[PDB]
């Protein structure tokens, strides 16, 4: 029923609301790095991501405006975004920040805010190679984005989101990089369905992004591939894990039902997406949020395929996001997409 979607929604806005600091930040993914002393927490992405999810919830402007003038405030002085101020911007980061400045196009102060976040992701666009690298390679001082670093490469998972950002953006002239980035999209493809993700540890999130890129631009056969891949790796009860082989979680089974919306929706896969929203209905915690699994990996910089070895890749364990917020922003996005389905 659309009710108990449209309540389960109400809540997980809610629940990112009261998350937000005053001044307009969402903080997450805290961990301790290699090197350094203290703990690093993410700021710039994750207000970025959550903001624009809540964007897509109809939050009104006194939750919105707070993140998108802290993030207009609080820009890397060489220009775009990062995990933090602390660390170096990323194509990830600045992407997350085009889409969410998206929500305020037409008003001419904004498009031209969005115009020059839209110039700052393309600093991190690789013609050549047909996609976008996550970090731009610096020479000198311990952040692993030096050169020659696996975080430097051109990444699909970043790529995808950064045509998505671009294509909300809305400027005409970002067509050819847009076209590009979906060529590279489509050529790395897995016969299965499925596209690999050099930060996620899994399968679901760089095919959730690609389809949807793909889907965008009219390119429909990938996205009914990915939908039939993501039907066979639905769990019994429900939901999705990572496809990989994990159990079912909330971010995992966020990733896949907006896949299926994309690919018929109830009238194709209606009893997989109402076992989903089931899944995610009961999973739901108290307070509106749903419970982090494992999700963001961070490879060793000299390993370029880390999807060839998940468990084995890793510079540190497997980040969670412990505030429950990038988890619930992923859950909100595919609730929208829900309620926007026949
Ligand atoms: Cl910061």
């Known amino acids: 029923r ?3 979607v449209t309540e389960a929604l109400a809540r997980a806005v809610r629940f990112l609301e009261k998350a937000r600091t005053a ?22 992405w994750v207000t ?37 101020l602390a660390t170096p ?12 400045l998206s929500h305020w ?23 050549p190679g047909r996609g976008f690298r996550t970090y731009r390679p610096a020479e000198r001082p311990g952040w692993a984005s030096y050169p020659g670093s696996s975080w430097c490469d051109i990444h ?21 990089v847009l076209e590009a980035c979906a060529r590279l999209l489509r050529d ?16 679901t999130y760089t095919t959730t992004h690609a389809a949807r890129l793909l889907f965008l631009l009219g390119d429909t056969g990938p996205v009914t591939r990915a939908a039939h891949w993501l039907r066979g790796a639905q769990q019994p ?3 999705w894990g990572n496809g990989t082989g994990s159990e079912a979680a909330a971010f995992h089974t966020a990733l896949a039902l907006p896949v299926l919306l994309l690919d018929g929706g109830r009238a194709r896969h209606g009893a997989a997406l109402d076992a989903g929203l089931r899944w995610l209905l009961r999973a739901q915690q108290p307070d509106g949020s749903w419970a982090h699994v494992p999700i963001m990996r961070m490879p060793r910089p000299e390993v370029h395929a880390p999807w060839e070895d998940p468990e084995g890749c890793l510079l540190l364990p497997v980040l969670t996001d412990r505030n429950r917020l990038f988890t619930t922003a992923t859950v909100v996005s595919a609730l929208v997409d829900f309620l926007a389905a026949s």
């Open 48 to 84: 970025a991501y959550a903001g624009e999810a809540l964007a897509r919830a109809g939050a009104g402007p006194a939750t919105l405006e707070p993140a998108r003038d802290w993030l207009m405030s609080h820009s890397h002085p060489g220009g775009g975004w990062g995990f933090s």
């Open 237 to 239: 009860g429900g939901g």
């Open 156 to 176: 699909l998972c970043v790529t995808a989101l950064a045509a998505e950002a671009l294509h909300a953006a809305g400027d005409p002239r970002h067509r050819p």
């Open 89 to 100: 911007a990323d194509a990830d980061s600045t992407a997350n920040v085009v889409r969410f």
């Open 188 to 203: 790395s493809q897995s016969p299965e369905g499925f596209w690999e993700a050099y930060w996620w540890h899994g399968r």
């Open 105 to 127: 196009r037409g008003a001419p102060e904004w498009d031209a805010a969005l115009g020059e976040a839209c110039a700052q992701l393309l600093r991190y666009w690789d013609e």
């Open 23 to 44: 001044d307009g930040r969402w903080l997450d993914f805290r961990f301790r790095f290699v090197v350094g002393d203290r703990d690093v927490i993410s700021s710039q």
């Open 2 to 4: 659309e009710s108990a």
